[PDB]
Write a protein that binds this ligand. Structure first.
Ligand SMILES: *[C@H]1O[C@H](CO)[C@@H](O[C@@H]2O[C@H](CO)[C@@H](O)[C@H](O)[C@H]2NC(C)=O)[C@H](O)[C@H]1NC(C)=O
Lengths: 29, 49
């Protein structure tokens, strides 16, 4: 469900491992 | 009126701090403020223009 973006000082920080990177690990295993 | 710079604004007795830009959305004639799902004003209609 759907600039820091969020008026009340709410921010979402991106994960260290991107979605593409996680798939690569899955492919490797 | 100012666009594309962060500014303190009051529109018809509504006060917010934000960056103002033109939008595609078309308001209903009678309504003036716009509000999102989380009840934060997302759009405003200037009375003058
Ligand atoms: C209120 O006055 C403003 C400013 O004179 C009007 O705005 C103008 O409207 C004319 C005709 O629509 C436009 O051609 C102009 O470009 C507009 N700006 C100016 C500065 O003249 C407005 O129409 C008037 N009436 C309202 C909002 O009811």
């Amino acid at each position: 469900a759907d600039c820091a973006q969020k008026f009340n000082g709410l921010t979402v920080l991106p994960p260290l491992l991107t979605d593409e990177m996680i798939a690569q690990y899955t492919s490797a295993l | 009126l100012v666009k594309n710079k962060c500014v303190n604004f009051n529109f018809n007795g509504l006060t917010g701090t934000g960056v103002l830009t033109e939008s595609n959305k078309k308001f209903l004639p009678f309504q003036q403020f716009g509000r999102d799902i989380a009840d934060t004003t997302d759009a405003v209609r200037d009375p003058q223009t």
